[PDB]
Amino acid sequence: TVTEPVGSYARAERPQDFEGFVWRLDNDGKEALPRNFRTSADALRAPEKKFHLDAAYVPSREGMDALHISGSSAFTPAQLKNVAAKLREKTAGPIYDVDLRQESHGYLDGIPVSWYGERDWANLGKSQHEALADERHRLHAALHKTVYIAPLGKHKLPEGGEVRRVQKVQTEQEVAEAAGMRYFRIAATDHVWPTPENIDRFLAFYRTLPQDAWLHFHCEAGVGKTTAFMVMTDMLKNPSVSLKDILYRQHEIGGFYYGEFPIKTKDKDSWKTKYYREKIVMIEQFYRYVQENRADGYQTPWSVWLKSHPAKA
């Protein structure tokens, strides 16, 4: 009798110890595009040293050209419009803004902000329904109110920033439409593997997309959750491609490497270690799901399949 199965370690943490306490600046808006902007049409570059990968290896590009996905960090309304434009030059299908942020976020006076709690876990433990409700109330309560927006610096604590009386409030859905992009929200928690619920929602969403749909995934930094869903999409759309090729190419176009590697972590980041290891196992577990469930068209949802086929540490 285990309390929390592999893939659900975060459930053991206490949400009450990571409540939001400040409006974090998601992007200074100085660049034309958000950080870590990348597409499946991009050329593959040398892997990062930290992952100890074979730089000489040439991963398969089978399906890359048809994959039609991209990723990036958070952004300003203007940076998103730039993304939409760049993507429109690559496709004629609907471009989706896939918001993988569980944390409450929005735009105050056009400034992209989020209600940050330690580890960005201000909405940890909440269902998507509750997280969105919190976000809706907080965004609305900020109108005509004085707010403190600041970027995080020393030890993930507010550093400088600005104070202003909000005159306009917008949700990402609104900003997404303004850029001519469809919107789909997946309330996934930062630093951890997406819950069975997050993936169940994404999978149902995937089966409904038209053939020419372009998915633009993004989170706060655009590395962790963004690469995971990019990887999942790659596996789903290109099931005949090996796990190695998938992980290598998703990494070499600007994403994170979700395979095994010497996980080195700072003393103040040691809490991340087990989550990184958990994600490596779950990545393999998802790959197994796709291989064993594509034949009948995914009749069995991920959550259900995962319960009868739990992963090992």
Q: Which stretches of the chain bind Cl ion, using CB under 5 A?
A: 127, 129, 190, 224-225
For Cl ion, the closer of residues 225 and 251 by Cβ is 225
For Cl ion, the closer of residues 241 and 283 by Cβ is 283
For Cl ion, the closer of residues 81 and 272 by Cβ is 272
3-state secondary structure of 170: strand
What torsion do the CA atoms of 235, 240, 243, 245 make, to the nearest 10 degrees? -100
Burial degree of 231 (CB within 10 A; 0-12, 13-18, 19+): buried
Q: Please, are residues 83 and 179 in contact by the beta-carbon 8 Å criterion?
A: yes
For the CB of residue 33, give the shortest distance to Cl ion in the complex, in Å: 19
The residue nearest Cl ion at its CB is 224
Rounded CA-CA distance 295/198 in Å is 23
For the CB of residue 129, give the shortest distance to Cl ion in the complex, in Å: 4
Q: What is the CA radius of gyration of the chain?
A: 19
Q: Please, are residues 217 and 36 in contact by the beta-carbon 8 Å criterion?
A: no
Rounded CA-CA distance 114/139 in Å is 10
Using the CB atoms, write b or e for 81-97: b if 16+ within 10 Å.
bbbbeebeeeeeeebbb
Q: Please, are residues 100 and 225 in contact by the beta-carbon 8 Å criterion?
A: yes
For Cl ion, the closer of residues 91 and 127 by Cβ is 127
For the CB of residue 123, give the shortest distance to Cl ion in the complex, in Å: 12
For the CB of residue 211, give the shortest distance to Cl ion in the complex, in Å: 29
For Cl ion, the closer of residues 34 and 224 by Cβ is 224
For the CB of residue 44, give the shortest distance to Cl ion in the complex, in Å: 22
For Cl ion, the closer of residues 127 and 291 by Cβ is 127
For the CB of residue 98, give the shortest distance to Cl ion in the complex, in Å: 14
